[PDB]
Each structure stands twice: as structure tokens, then as C-alpha cells.
């Protein structure tokens, strides 16, 4: 069960950035992948359940967008107008009626 | 509205204890499982232990038998039970709870826990 996140970086305010989670290993039935963000504390960002269904942070609602390509087990966060308050390290999160819980590496994402 | 209050952190002696209690208030709207996750100094984040709401329980290898996972169902308050700390053991506990039909999650502030 391995979790490859990726995508992160610095960007000027207004900046788009898309990130991925890609996944291997997964011993288990379709998971269920959200996005959390460490802010200088921990918020749920956005998840799509698996079955499809897909929920956002009502601070990025509209400028944030979840994607997930089944084939390669791969979820992207589309993030557009980044603005200062969405800096933060951001790790990738799995579960799988499993309740296991796993996370990526974190990838980080700077804005000015 | 949702709003979770950790506590309990504090420091310890290598083998000590301490209960963590992450109190969840405002309207859920759904039974929720509660997860703990630690975050060592300058490491990522680790699923330590989990309570499903049917009751079902679940540990991270590394802390079964030392830690004990409890919830109050009545007070919609989830308790972290750490026996036996070890210096290992040592970062900042956050409680997850995730309730949804709905993947909705949230998480508490973190409290510290420190073992010399």
C-alpha cells in the first residue's frame, strides 16, 4: 500500500496548481481518496468516496476541482486562484467497509 | 459549526500515561468514526486508533496493547487511553472524525504529547 503524491510547489497569488495521488498496492475494495492540508492546523479539503460521489471545503468550492482516473488509480486536485491562504503542506489521504487509514508524503505548496 | 476540543496532551517520563479526550460539538448529522493521527516533530502524519460508530475498534501495530480507543457516545466525546509511552511516541495527537452518508471530515486542534 504505497501512496505517490505529487504536483507541489511555489506559486505567485492567483496561480493554478494541479496535484496527484497516485496509488499502488491497494489490497482492498475502491477507496475512498480526500486531500488534507497542514497550514502553518489539518483541514479536509475535498474526497471523492469511490461510488463517484464528490465533496469540497466550502473555501475552495469552485476553484477546486476532484478527479480520479480509475485505470492508472490516480486522483487529481485541480487548484485555481491560489491565493495566500491555501499554503500549506498537502498530503493525500486513503480508506478502504474497511477503516484503514493512509497517507502520502506530503507534497508542499507555497503562494505569495 | 462542527468543532472538536483536544486535550489531555502533556509530558511523561519514558513509561508514563495520559488519556487524550477529543469532545465533538454542533450538528454531525450522521453516526461518526473517530480517528486519532499523530505527527512526529518534522515527520508526516500516522493513523494510530479508530472507533467505526457500530463500535468496531482498529490499532496501529505499534500501540495495541498500550493504547485503548473509547468513545461516549452520550457526550459525543472520543477518548485516546497511553499507557506505556514511549519516546516514540512522542509528537502531536489530532482526533478525525469523518461522518458521512457525505465524506465529511474534521479534525481537533492537536494536543502535544512529549516523552523523555
Known amino acids: 500500500?504505497?501512496?505517490?503524491?505529487?504536483?507541489?510547489?511555489?506559486?505567485?497569488?492567483?496561480?493554478?496548481?494541479?496535484?496527484?495521488?497516485?496509488?499502488?498496492?491497494?489490497?482492498?475494495?475502491?477507496?475512498?481518496?480526500?486531500?488534507?492540508?497542514?497550514?502553518?492546523?489539518?483541514?479536509?479539503?475535498?474526497?471523492?468516496?469511490?461510488?463517484?460521489?464528490?465533496?469540497?471545503?466550502?473555501?475552495?468550492?469552485?476553484?477546486?476541482?476532484?478527479?480520479?482516473?480509475?485505470?492508472?488509480?490516480?486522483?487529481?486536485?485541480?487548484?485555481?486562484?491560489?491565493?495566500?491562504?491555501?499554503?500549506?503542506?498537502?498530503?493525500?489521504?486513503?480508506?478502504?467497509?474497511?477503516?484503514?487509514?493512509?497517507?502520502?508524503?506530503?507534497?508542499?505548496?507555497?503562494?505569495? | 459549526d462542527v468543532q472538536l476540543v483536544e486535550s489531555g496532551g502533556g509530558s511523561v517520563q519514558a513509561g508514563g500515561s495520559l488519556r487524550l479526550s477529543c469532545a465533538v460539538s454542533?450538528?454531525?448529522?450522521?453516526?461518526?468514526?473517530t480517528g486519532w493521527v499523530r505527527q512526529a516533530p518534522g515527520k508526516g502524519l500516522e493513523w494510530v486508533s479508530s472507533?467505526?460508530?457500530?463500535?468496531?475498534?482498529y490499532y496501529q501495530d505499534s500501540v495495541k496493547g498500550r493504547f485503548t480507543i473509547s468513545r461516549d457516545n452520550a457526550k459525543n466525546t472520543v477518548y485516546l487511553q497511553m499507557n506505556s509511552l514511549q519516546r516514540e511516541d512522542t509528537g502531536m495527537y489530532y482526533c478525525?472524525?469523518?461522518?458521512?452518508?457525505?465524506?465529511?471530515?474534521?479534525w481537533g486542534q492537536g494536543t502535544q504529547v512529549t516523552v523523555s
Open positions: 454542533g450538528s454531525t448529522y450522521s453516526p461518526c468514526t
Open positions: 478525525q472524525i469523518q461522518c458521512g452518508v457525505s465524506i465529511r471530515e474534521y
Open positions: 472507533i467505526s460508530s457500530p463500535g468496531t475498534i
